[PDB]
Design an enzyme around this catalytic site. Structure first.
Site, PDB file in Angstrom:
ATOM      1  N   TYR A  78       3.950  -8.660  -9.043  1.00 16.91           N
ATOM      2  CA  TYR A  78       4.486  -8.197  -7.773  1.00 16.91           C
ATOM      3  C   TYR A  78       4.230  -9.228  -6.688  1.00 16.91           C
ATOM      4  O   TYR A  78       3.176  -9.869  -6.622  1.00 16.91           O
ATOM      5  CB  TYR A  78       3.973  -6.811  -7.361  1.00 16.91           C
TER       6      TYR A  78
ATOM      7  N   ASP B 151       3.679  -9.185  -3.137  1.00 20.68           N
ATOM      8  CA  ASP B 151       3.396  -8.224  -2.077  1.00 20.68           C
ATOM      9  C   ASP B 151       4.125  -8.596  -0.790  1.00 20.68           C
ATOM     10  O   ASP B 151       4.678  -7.724  -0.109  1.00 20.68           O
ATOM     11  CB  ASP B 151       1.888  -8.112  -1.853  1.00 20.68           C
ATOM     12  N   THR B 152       4.190  -9.891  -0.471  1.00 21.35           N
ATOM     13  CA  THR B 152       4.880 -10.309   0.745  1.00 21.35           C
ATOM     14  C   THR B 152       6.391 -10.198   0.585  1.00 21.35           C
ATOM     15  O   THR B 152       7.049  -9.477   1.342  1.00 21.35           O
ATOM     16  CB  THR B 152       4.469 -11.735   1.108  1.00 21.35           C
TER      17      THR B 152
ATOM     18  N   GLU C  12       8.478  -8.931  -1.885  1.00 25.26           N
ATOM     19  CA  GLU C  12       9.103  -7.713  -2.393  1.00 25.26           C
ATOM     20  C   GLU C  12       8.734  -6.464  -1.594  1.00 25.26           C
ATOM     21  O   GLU C  12       9.571  -5.573  -1.431  1.00 25.26           O
ATOM     22  CB  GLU C  12       8.729  -7.514  -3.865  1.00 25.26           C
TER      23      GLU C  12
ATOM     24  N   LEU D 290       6.691  -6.391   1.606  1.00 26.34           N
ATOM     25  CA  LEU D 290       6.519  -6.686   3.034  1.00 26.34           C
ATOM     26  C   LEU D 290       5.130  -6.255   3.505  1.00 26.34           C
ATOM     27  O   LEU D 290       4.931  -5.096   3.887  1.00 26.34           O
ATOM     28  CB  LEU D 290       7.614  -6.025   3.888  1.00 26.34           C
TER      29      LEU D 290
ATOM     30  N   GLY E  66       3.370  -6.769   6.140  1.00 22.30           N
ATOM     31  CA  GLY E  66       3.167  -6.363   7.519  1.00 22.30           C
ATOM     32  C   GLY E  66       3.395  -4.881   7.758  1.00 22.30           C
ATOM     33  O   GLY E  66       2.768  -4.286   8.640  1.00 22.30           O
TER      34      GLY E  66
ATOM     35  N   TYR F 285      -4.194  -2.238  -4.134  1.00 21.92           N
ATOM     36  CA  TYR F 285      -4.821  -3.401  -3.544  1.00 21.92           C
ATOM     37  C   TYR F 285      -4.862  -3.364  -2.011  1.00 21.92           C
ATOM     38  O   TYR F 285      -3.996  -2.864  -1.294  1.00 21.92           O
ATOM     39  CB  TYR F 285      -4.166  -4.715  -4.032  1.00 21.92           C
ATOM     40  N   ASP F 286      -5.948  -3.935  -1.493  1.00 19.12           N
ATOM     41  CA  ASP F 286      -6.136  -4.097  -0.050  1.00 19.12           C
ATOM     42  C   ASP F 286      -6.545  -5.533   0.188  1.00 19.12           C
ATOM     43  O   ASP F 286      -7.420  -6.057  -0.521  1.00 19.12           O
ATOM     44  CB  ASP F 286      -7.221  -3.164   0.513  1.00 19.12           C
TER      45      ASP F 286
HETATM   46  O1  HY1 Z   1       1.110  -4.110  -4.734  1.00 25.78           O
HETATM   47  C1  HY1 Z   1       2.435  -3.723  -5.012  1.00 25.78           C
HETATM   48  C2  HY1 Z   1       2.502  -3.015  -6.359  1.00 25.78           C
HETATM   49  C3  HY1 Z   1       2.135  -1.536  -6.238  1.00 25.78           C
HETATM   50  C4  HY1 Z   1       2.820  -0.712  -5.353  1.00 25.78           C
HETATM   51  C5  HY1 Z   1       2.485   0.632  -5.263  1.00 25.78           C
HETATM   52  C6  HY1 Z   1       1.473   1.144  -6.062  1.00 25.78           C
HETATM   53  C7  HY1 Z   1       0.790   0.318  -6.942  1.00 25.78           C
HETATM   54  C8  HY1 Z   1       1.121  -1.024  -7.034  1.00 25.78           C
HETATM   55 CU    CU Z   2      -7.734  -9.101  -8.814  1.00 27.29          CU
END
Ligand code: HY1
Ligand code: CU
Ligand code: HY1
Ligand code: CU
Ligand code: NA
Ligand code: NA
Ligand code: NA
Ligand code: NA
EC number: 1.4.3.21
Lengths: 620, 620
Positions: free
Chosen positions: B288, B290-291, B293, B295, B297, B374-375
């Site tokens: 994934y 994160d930025t 796909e 976003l 912010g 994730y954080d």
């Molecule tokens: O970090 C994006 C992948 C994701 C999104 C929503 C729940 C678990 C994992």
């Molecule tokens: Cu990790």
């Protein structure tokens, strides 16, 4: 009552009296090193015997001696005369710092060289630099220092701004003879001053910085008992101090439930070396071992509240010996405090609705030392989550030279006509490991890339491999940042709840190691610095990676000789020696006083605990 | 008045009205991205035109659109229909997070799989995961999410402790069809809970931590004007916020005397990717962005005083658009504060007698985001001495799986039956450089070892070499920790007082780059991640290393396509793209909530100033 307590003034006075009564401390004697010896393996007898090791120099030319004394019994245990051509010279004495300049001031060759440059001899400072071992046969068995000159225009002037290039002298500090004066040609003495407190150089001081107040209204979270035993946030350890190594950490352990679990038996910086990369004959011999040749502990600074250490500070004031056996207190030589360290753990969960934040903190144990132009801070950090970290902070004034007209491949220009030779700062950490006890082993862990194909049809898989180091001859290892290489210290006889051996992982910074040609004098004398990681079997007398007597030792002492024993290290009492350092190409911003730069390493738990060890941290 | 000011609620409302009146925001439309555009090169006309870029999704199956709007003039500038099979799908919408679980709950294949495992469908959470591009021809041009299931035993339960392995489904979120359900076999659902606020798991909370109070009795040393313009200790910059990239730094400059000297025109984290290294077909598609796909912010946390940010905190509350064009405030989304940072410079001089100590500090600009398990905290630091540093802090809950009986080469065991697949977290920093202006160049600097011999008779010399990168085709570079490799960004037309070009040096952490096979889908879609450093010629439309539309893009967009233009970068307006990341083999200590781990980079002045820039710091 603890055998790991700091040396007391009374203990040092007793050592002085024992040595005097035994006839070993006459007027011509000087103590070059004095330190308490650690308890031997198997201290579970309560039969305490506080023993001290002493190196005794003789200013009249007699052989120096190594002496071991029992303060508990008031006796000399052993006294051995040293053949320094064989085993090395004793560390440099503080009182020899002045002797090089004083001897040169009456030498006709030195005065002729200064006269040609129109330099007043009263304004010329001479740095007392260790000699190493090079081509000069007359130096074997003699106590030599080399001198490089710097001009002070007035008593408060920074002499480092005014190097006298093209000139070097060698001095026998016992016979008080100048053996050689080498003048390769006249360089202009750089004229700009480097006085960083002069308003003409600083300009008006900033008025924009508002105060930051750090206080602990209920006092600190750690306790100090027995003078030097620390308990903090499940950590337990003893803070030692040795005049050679500085701060030493003993008996690092973590209270996991009702069990006190050992991690590290003894941690120290056991050597450091600064090799210079300038091929000029004026400086190509220059490599100083601040720890092994000069003893960094004896130059520890007294640290000022609010300036050097900020917050709620607990000080230790270690006691050392002067050259005559008198106790000397280094007031406020060690700072101890805890620091907020940001976020420890955080999660906001989309399904449970629970928002969770916890803050981290670290315990800091630090001292600062000054040896000539250089100043270093040594910092040990303990974190809530089981991480142990070391950080060296390098500052002070860079060592200078002339900057040659037409440039240099080995010197940076800092100011008109003023150069700074390239060099490194390389440290050795000695970690006497005790992961859940003394049966430990080291594994090298590399990332493993996998090829796309059967069983990996999308070409996404990657893995890791661990290689056990079983004997000392295979335990000399190099970094490999590209493969994410780390080293795991584990205990094969102590398992976590998943039946995996408990361990700690060493994360290096992967900085370059010693750059000198492998056939060089410094490569032989600082062999430890040529490799990132060494593992040895514990032995009482294998203390320093460079051997006991570093000054003017011809080479090969220490780690290369230890590992030739090829001892079993697979599930044994072992010691990890980690080399790490900075490679310094000086920049204009380093002048006239250098902002701190840092290097270090850290160790993190790797299946040591059965789950996160910080679930019981409260919500602030 | 500043063109770099944060978007206001009024601006977003005007955008909504402009889009509505133009017929572009009917009931079937959703805003997937909305952001202000930076001023074009040459803003020295004062003719401000606040323009916004919008991606508009259509839930009925119509083609999405990219739209540019001028709020200043109240007009639609351009509107383009997108062919998503060609140029990629739009970012994932927050409202689609729920849709995957809801569609699966009525699919007979999904219910049959849950029935065999005796799982109540009401207790099964489904993670909405981006799909990537693999072998499934029916997915081209369709908006697909993939789902992995986790059990919640009760509403406050951590579902991550209970992965349902062996099961995955693919969903078309527009047509609302489940395309495939794949069941490779029954794995036991791990039974231990991971509830890190449950007293049975934490035990009694510590009572040993005493408070640390950090206050600024005269207020902070920085000023905020125009909403987001910062001035602090000679630094000047503007703090931006974009829903895709998060915090963006504009116009980083340093006041050197009476001159405001630019350093960085725009700094951001322009992409991040988390590739998984488990070859199981249940997860081997999992990567994934994160930025790009999701976003990052839009998922910024509201930060609590004393818990998330400690001290004298100044908050910014950026405004973003929701999916319907309504403005939404992220209250206390950005923290700003200064921190003490230990010793800045220190020296005690044996010849002048002067003792000198100064303390360092840094300005911190941070936000925290949460995307599923994730954080991440994103931290930008400015130091007194001209250093700029970025740090990412990774925490949250690791993504879990079953742990197979008999073990795994690609998964760590965290608890009985519970695994965590190996993975990486890889970031791309985009640094639009402006070292003393826009004419910049990049040099690669390696340490040079020298052989003992003529001109180096003692074998001590070492040097450095710098290689100028002149064209984009030669500006794709790899790290080399062993040779101390760094990169210098300099301005060949701006010299310091020694007639050397001014510059800044980039210091990388030298962590491994993308591990996947180079023939893999992720290697093509995340090509930026395969190399440590890229340099491109600035262009308005070259914003992200992965292209504009990352979701389900087939590959090769972004940096590999940009550098094929082979433009001149030797003394030109250039952009540095630095890849850095963590390789994560999860440890038991990461469970059930992970202590922070960190990665980043820093830039230090390299002959940018004529001497140390902190001589005018006062003595506290
Ligand atoms: O970090 C994006 C992948 C994701 C999104 C929503 C729940 C678990 C994992
Ligand atoms: Cu990790
Ligand atoms: O750091 C030890 C070498 C040294 C000692 C004294 C003055 C300058 C340099
Ligand atoms: Cu240095
Ligand atoms: Na010898
Ligand atoms: Na040991
Ligand atoms: Na395509
Ligand atoms: Na640029």
């Amino acid at each position: 009552a603890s055998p790991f307590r700091l040396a007391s003034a009374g203990e040092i006075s007793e050592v002085q009296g024992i040595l005097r009564t035994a006839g070993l401390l006459g007027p011509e004697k000087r103590i070059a090193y004095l330190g308490v010896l650690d308890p031997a393996r198997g201290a579970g007898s309560e039969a305490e015997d506080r023993r001290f090791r002493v190196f005794i120099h003789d200013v009249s030319g007699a052989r120096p001696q190594e002496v071991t004394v029992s303060v508990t019994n008031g006796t000399v245990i052993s006294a051995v005369e040293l053949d320094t051509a064989a085993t090395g010279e004793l560390p440099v004495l503080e009182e020899e710092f002045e002797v090089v300049e004083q001897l040169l001031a009456t030498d006709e060759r030195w005065l002729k060289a200064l006269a040609a440059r129109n330099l007043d001899v009263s304004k010329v400072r001479v740095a007392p630099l260790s000699a190493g071992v090079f081509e000069y046969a007359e130096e074997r068995g003699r106590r030599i220092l080399r001198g490089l000159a710097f001009v002070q225009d007035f008593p408060e002037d920074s002499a480092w701004a005014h190097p006298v290039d093209g000139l070097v002298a060698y001095v026998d500090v016992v016979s008080k003879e100048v053996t050689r004066v080498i003048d390769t040609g006249v360089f202009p003495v750089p004229a700009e001053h480097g006085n960083y407190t002069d308003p003409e150089l600083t300009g008006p001081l900033r008025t924009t910085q508002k105060p930051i107040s750090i206080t602990q209204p209920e006092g600190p979270s750690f306790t100090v008992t027995g003078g030097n035993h620390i308990e903090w946030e499940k950590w337990s350890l003893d803070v030692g101090f040795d005049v050679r190594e500085g701060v030493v950490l003993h008996n690092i352990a973590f209270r996991d439930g009702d069990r006190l679990r050992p991690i590290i038996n003894r941690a120290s910086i056991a050597e450091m070396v600064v090799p210079y990369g300038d091929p000029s004959p004026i400086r190509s011999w220059q490599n100083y071992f601040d720890t092994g040749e000069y003893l960094v502990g004896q130059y520890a600074n007294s640290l000022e509240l609010g300036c050097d250490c900020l917050g709620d500070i607990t000080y230790l004031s270690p006691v050392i010996s002067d050259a005559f056996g008198n106790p000397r207190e280094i007031r406020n030589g060690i700072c101890m405090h805890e620091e907020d360290w940001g976020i420890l753990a955080k999660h906001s969960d989309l399904w449970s609705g629970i928002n969770y934040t916890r803050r981290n903190r670290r315990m800091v144990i630090s001292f600062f030392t000054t040896i000539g132009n250089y100043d270093y801070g040594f910092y040990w950090y303990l974190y809530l989550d089981g991480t142990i970290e070391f950080e060296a902070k390098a500052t002070g004034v860079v060592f200078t030279s002339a900057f040659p007209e037409g440039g240099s491949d080995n010197i940076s220009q800092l100011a008109p006509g003023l150069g700074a030779p390239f060099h490194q700062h390389i440290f050795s950490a000695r970690l006497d490991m005790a992961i859940d006890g003394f049966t430990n082993r080291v594994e090298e862990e590399d990332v493993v890339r996998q090829t796309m194909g059967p069983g990996n049809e999308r070409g996404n898989a990657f893995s890791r491999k661990r290689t056990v180091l079983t004997r000392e001859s295979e335990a000399v290892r190099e970094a490999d940042a590209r493969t994410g290489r780390t080293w795991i210290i584990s205990n094969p006889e102590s398992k976590n709840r998943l039946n995996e051996p408990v361990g700690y992982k060493l994360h290096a910074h992967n900085q370059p190691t010693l750059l000198a040609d492998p056939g060089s004098s410094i490569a032989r004398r600082a062999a430890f610095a040529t490799k990132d990681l060494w593992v040895t079997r514990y032995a009482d007398d294998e203390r320093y990676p460079t051997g006991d007597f570093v000054n003017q030792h011809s080479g090969g002492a220490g780690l290369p000789s230890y590992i030739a024993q090829d001892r079993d290290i697979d599930g044994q009492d072992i010691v990890v020696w980690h080399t790490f350092g900075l490679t310094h190409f000086p920049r204009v911003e380093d002048w006239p006083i250098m902002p701190v730069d840092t290097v270090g390493f850290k160790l993190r738990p790797e299946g040591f605990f059965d789950r996160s060890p910080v679930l019981d941290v409260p919500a602030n």
